[PDB]
């Protein structure tokens, strides 16, 4: 049982050690498309690239490239798109991806500014009466409503395909209280947030995959998907304690590199699953 493994690693202070074995066992697949010179300004970080095998392709004939990966968890029957925080020049590609994949939710785990630097472009409207038009991808985005809570904000957005005049409602879930350094002290508000996403229908098989991002789309984004998938597998299985968080993480790392950036994010992921298991047993 993971709770006792938690006890052992914590008492022995073997978090980094565990983290390094995960790093060494992690898959390495080609990322040739990401490294083409015509795509250099589509990548926020030169060392964070989607693998070619799992990369999301845009349906535009010119350049299909976005820094986004499909993570397919076959036993849990859950998919996620993990992406970077859009850049000033990829906001239109971001919303084209949302459209093309039939996503119902966008999960944002960062602030636009952290540590005095921009981590993401402002890619959604701040006021109902000031909608955004992405001329490169022929999309219009309107803020419908905004519900601001202590730990997170939920926004209803209308995305319109200006080409076909079809519209969809997109939910934006914005976790606003992840600290600039380290991880939250308690997983309580992160679990609350994860249950609110689930309750919305955004993670359900009747929609395209949820879009999940932070700045790079590997650290906090990784923690979100890892906790969700582990708790779902504990619901599904005859024996809940058969769920090994290290194996799930390695299965998720076949689809996108570097998921869970620090030993502190790993320890936080265990804490989130262990605490969330109580509210599921």
Ligand X SMILES: COC[C@H]1N(S(C)(=O)=O)[C@H]2CC[C@]1(O)CC2
Restricted to residues 117-136, the positions that interact with ligand X (CB under 6 A) are: none
Q: In whole angstroms, give the CA distance from residue 62 to residue 69.
A: 20
The single residue among 1, 3, 7, 16 that binds ligand X, judged by CB under 6 A, is 16
Q: Does 20 bind ligand X (CB under 6 A)?
A: no
Query: Which of 91, 120, 214, 263: binder of ligand X (CB under 6 A)?
Result: 263
215 is in an annotated binding site: yes
User: Which one of 120, 214, 225, 230 is the catalytic residue?
Assistant: 214
CA atoms lying within 13 Å on the CB side of residue 176:
11
In 3-state terms the chain splits into helix, strand, coil percentages (rounded to 5) of: 35, 20, 45
Residue 120 is a catalytic residue = no
Asked whether the beta carbons of 174 and 108 are under 8 A apart, the reply is yes
Write down the least CB distance from residue 267 to ligand X, Å.
5
Judged by CB under 6 A, the residue of 5, 6, 15, 196 near ligand X is 15
Please tell me whether 23 is known to bind a ligand: no
Cα 153 → chain centroid: 16
147: which 2 tokens? Answer: 């519900």
16/36 with CB nearer ligand X: 16
Q: DSSP readout, 3-45?
A: HHHHHHHHHHT-HHHHHHHHHHHS-----HHHHSGGGGGG-S-
Q: Please choose, out of 50-58, 132-140, 224-232, 259-267, the segment that lies near ligand X by the rule CB under 6 A.
A: 259-267
Q: Is 267 annotated as a binding residue?
A: no
Nearer to ligand X, 209 or 222 (CB): 222
What is the contact surface with ligand X in residues (CB under 6 A)? 13, 15-16, 263-264, 267
**Residues with catalytic annotation?**
214
């Amino acid at each position: 049982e993971m709770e006792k493994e938690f006890e052992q690693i914590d008492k022995s202070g073997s978090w980094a050690a565990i983290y390094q074995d995960i790093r060494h066992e992690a898959s390495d697949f080609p990322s040739r498309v990401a490294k083409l010179p015509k795509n250099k300004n589509r990548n926020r970080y030169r060392d964070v690239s989607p693998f070619d095998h799992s990369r999301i392709k845009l349906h535009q004939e010119d350049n299909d490239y976005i820094n986004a990966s499909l993570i397919k968890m076959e036993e849990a029957q859950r998919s996620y798109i993990l992406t970077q925080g859009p850049l000033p020049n990829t906001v239109g590609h971001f919303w084209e991806m949302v459209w093309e994949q039939k996503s119902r939710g966008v999960v944002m785990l960062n602030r636009v500014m952290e540590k005095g630097s921009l981590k993401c472009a402002q890619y959604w409207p701040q006021k109902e009466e000031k909608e955004m038009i992405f001329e490169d991808t022929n999309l219009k985005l309107t803020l419908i409503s905004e519900d601001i809570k202590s730990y997170y904000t939920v926004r209803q957005l209308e995305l319109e395909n200006l080409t076909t005049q079809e519209t969809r409602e997109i939910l934006h879930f914005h976790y606003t209280t992840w600290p600039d350094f380290g991880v939250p002290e308690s997983p309580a508000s992160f679990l609350n947030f994860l249950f609110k996403v689930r309750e919305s229908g955004s993670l359900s098989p009747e929609h395209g995959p949820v879009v999940v991002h932070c700045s790079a789309g590997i650290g906090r984004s990784g923690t979100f998907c890892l906790a969700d998938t582990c708790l779902l597998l504990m619901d599904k299985r005859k024996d809940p304690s058969s769920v090994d968080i290290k194996k799930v993480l390695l299965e998720m790392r076949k689809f996108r590199m570097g998921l869970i950036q620090t030993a502190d994010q790993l320890r936080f992921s265990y804490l989130a699953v262990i605490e969330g298991a109580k509210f599921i047993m």
